[PDB]
Design a protein around this nucleic acid. Structure first.
Lengths: 122, 101, 50, 77
RNA sequence: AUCAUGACAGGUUAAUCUUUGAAUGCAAAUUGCGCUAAACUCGAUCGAGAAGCAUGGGUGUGACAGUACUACA
RNA sequence: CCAUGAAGCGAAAAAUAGUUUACUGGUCACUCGUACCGAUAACCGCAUCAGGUCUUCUAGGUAAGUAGCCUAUGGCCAUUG
RNA sequence: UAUUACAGAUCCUAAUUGAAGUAGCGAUUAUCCAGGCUUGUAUCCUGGGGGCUGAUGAGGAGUAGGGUUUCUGGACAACUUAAACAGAUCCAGAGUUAGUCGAUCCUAAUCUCAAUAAUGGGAGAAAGGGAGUACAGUUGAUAUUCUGUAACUGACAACAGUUCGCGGCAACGCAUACUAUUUUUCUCCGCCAAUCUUAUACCGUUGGUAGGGAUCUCUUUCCUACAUGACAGUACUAAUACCC
RNA sequence: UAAGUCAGAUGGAAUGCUGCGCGAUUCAGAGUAAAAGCCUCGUAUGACCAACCGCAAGCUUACGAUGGACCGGGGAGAGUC
RNA sequence: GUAGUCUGCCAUACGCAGGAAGACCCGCUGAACUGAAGCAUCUCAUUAAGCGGAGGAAAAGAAACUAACUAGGAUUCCCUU
């Protein structure tokens, strides 16, 4: 029967791939027999096994990605798949350190001429 | 010659996707196909629209373990592909059709 | 026709499978009445112009 | 002369389906009248401001674009 | 499916993401015609799929062209 | 003929160099179209409109005949009583 | 406080009168009688008269265009100038099979990019160019596409057996490679007129045998049938062209 | 997150009619077989307990920065005005 | 001959440009109906349409500026003049 997304995380990659192909076979046999027999109950079984074969494909792909990101993380020029999504505008806008960095004239005067606190007496 | 510094697309896909099971959709149920099974020893199937006769002949062989003689290929007025697959003389097309049902 | 292209044939397929009466069970579900299938036609009366 | 008899030999097609528009693509001149394909920019004029907003964004699905409206609701509310 | 191993028309984010389109391997009223070091995956050394390959300009790297300038022969 | 009546892909031949032995006698052949009408009601004329729209196979007799008239094969009674 | 009072604007939109059961129901050969199916047919089907079309045919088939109108089953609220069980109408299913037919490939008129260190690339014909298929059978609808039988063309493999250039004075014959350059040919070409001749059709003189039609009398009669595909071969008859 | 599905008659149904209670920092509004402060969602109003609690830039004690005065100096945008 | 440079062209590694939208914003281009009871300068108008290009705002902006005083002191906008 149908199976949870939680407990498939524990299983091995090759254990899922034989599970996948066996689970996908019983989809194909039911698609043969829906022409002949048709009718109720079968049409919920074909629905569930279409949902389950996605379940196995999904958790394989996140099992890949979390492993495969760890290989390329903390390293220069990562692949395009593993970069975060973002907007076009936000990528091409330069990082706020570079915009805000101070000239050697400006930083040396900012030693004295910073935006200091003050107040008045009552 | 060319050699990139990293893979661009790192993630390979999970399975074949364009599979043997998803080439051959399933058998066609008509009065014409009933005659062609019994008389000519010739099955009929709904097929993927991009599948060639070379793809069908191999994909039919992997599933049912029978190498076909010919494959002849319609595209219907419903815009799905129909494949008239002649089986060889030894196997009977009723006996393969009874397994599927 | 004959000698149609494939993407011509794709349109003529979609134009004939879309041509049908509306199903009975939508009127039972939604309870609306008097919805017609818009892409119904007759071949002789209205031409497609595609 | 110029009416019913001369309608007889009208069997050729001046316009054909256009790839970008999908709608009036001129076969001899090879241009989509409605959208201007294959010019890289898409055809619209400010004198047809009525007819433009039938084509322009909102009319279709907006698959990527509707979720980027929905973010900006949450951030400012 | 019920005091949860948690129902589904709920809401996000991330996957998957068909043929197209700036559309970008070369074309197109055509499902036309290409190309590839390894790796990937079936396929039993050698085929296939999968995924690549556009133009323009920037910095770097390399290679070629010149009776252009110059030194040492 | 004061008109001289396509191109290209492709194929073979010959000559001149150079390199040479050749000839005859299993497997596979991808992709897309394929129904029917073609005016007589299926196309264009708002329509099952006496209009218009490119071509093909072309029987006997009468006769100079691919005329008009009559008839086998084929198709028909299209048309309110 | 105002988008505030209608009989008119050849006003706007929506519905409806008289005329009126009137005008009219055209064009296309011609219908008649008995049966079948039905509540119900001149009309849908069968049989038999009488007719029409009269090979540029309402015959059999295709471009362009249409796009399921094709096919079988059921149905008559509407439509097909009356009727209707019928229909190109309505409803539910089903149907288009290719190495050889086309597209794909090549260029034409013509269009469009690129380079100039270049001398072009690409598009453009389902009537031009273009390697290769025929018969018979079968389905409710597909066939040069499916099945049977017989061919043919191209590409990629090894492998077995032959073979290492000769005949004729000559025109020429017979078993011989590959790369490149140049040169030439086939592809390959207007229109009109005449003569000769295969194939197909048709009319013929000579008979003949199979079946059917006709008959008071006459007619050894009248009608139908008498056929062999692509492909492959080698005889001598006999041609015209050109050459020895 | 307050307070009557109050009692009686009529009705298919009571939120209306007659009479007695109660809430309000809540009589904005809607739903409910009929017109609802008290049938339900809310409204009002403070209290409650989780999540966070960081990004760059500059600091941080003096010949370090900045300014005034005095001494001695250089120059200030060409096919442009 | 080789070893520097100069100039040109080709190949390649890594990020960038194009397209959408365009009310507002920036730079060009640029009408006529109309009014003048005609019409030609003028007006409508340095407007509409057209071409090119930005951002959540844009553009402007730190005096070769006003002033003539008992002197103001970058740019933008509102009131008045």
């Amino acid at each position: 029967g149908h199976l949870k997304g939680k407990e498939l995380i524990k299983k091995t990659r090759q254990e899922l791939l034989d599970e996948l192909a066996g689970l996908e076979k019983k989809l194909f046999e039911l698609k043969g027999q829906k022409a002949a027999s048709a009718a109720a109950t079968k049409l919920t079984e074909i629905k569930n096994t279409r949902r389950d074969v996605a379940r196995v494909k999904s958790i394989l792909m996140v099992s890949q990605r979390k492993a495969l990101q760890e290989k390329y993380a903390k390293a220069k020029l990562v692949p395009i798949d593993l970069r975060k999504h973002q907007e076009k505008s936000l990528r091409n806008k330069l990082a706020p350190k570079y915009a805000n960095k101070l000239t050697a004239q400006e930083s040396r005067r900012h030693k004295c001429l910073f935006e200091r606190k003050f107040a008045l007496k009552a | 010659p060319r050699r990139p510094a990293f893979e661009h697309k790192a993630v390979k896909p999970v399975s074949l996707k364009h599979n043997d099971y998803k080439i051959i959709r399933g058998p066609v149920t008509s009065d014409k196909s009933t005659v062609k099974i019994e008389n000519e020893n010739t099955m009929t199937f709904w097929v993927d629209i991009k599948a060639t006769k070379t793809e069908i002949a191999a994909a039919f062989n992997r599933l049912y373990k029978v190498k076909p003689v010919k494959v002849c290929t319609v595209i219907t007025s419903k815009f799905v592909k129909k494949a008239y697959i002649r089986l060889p003389a030894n196997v009977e097309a009723m006996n393969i059709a009874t397994e599927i049902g | 026709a004959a000698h149609k292209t494939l993407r011509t044939k794709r349109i003529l397929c979609k134009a004939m499978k879309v041509n049908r009466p509306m199903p009975q069970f939508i009127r039972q579900m939604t309870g609306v009445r008097h919805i017609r299938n818009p892409l119904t036609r007759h071949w002789r009366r209205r031409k497609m112009n595609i | 002369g110029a009416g019913t008899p001369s309608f007889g030999p009208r069997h050729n097609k001046t316009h054909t389906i256009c790839r970008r528009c999908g709608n009036c693509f001129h076969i001899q001149k090879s241009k989509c009248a409605k959208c201007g394909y294959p010019d890289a920019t898409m055809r619209h004029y400010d004198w047809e401001k009525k007819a433009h907003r039938k084509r322009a964004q909102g009319s279709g699905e907006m698959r990527h674009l509707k979720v980027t409206f929905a973010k900006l609701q949450r951030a400012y509310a």
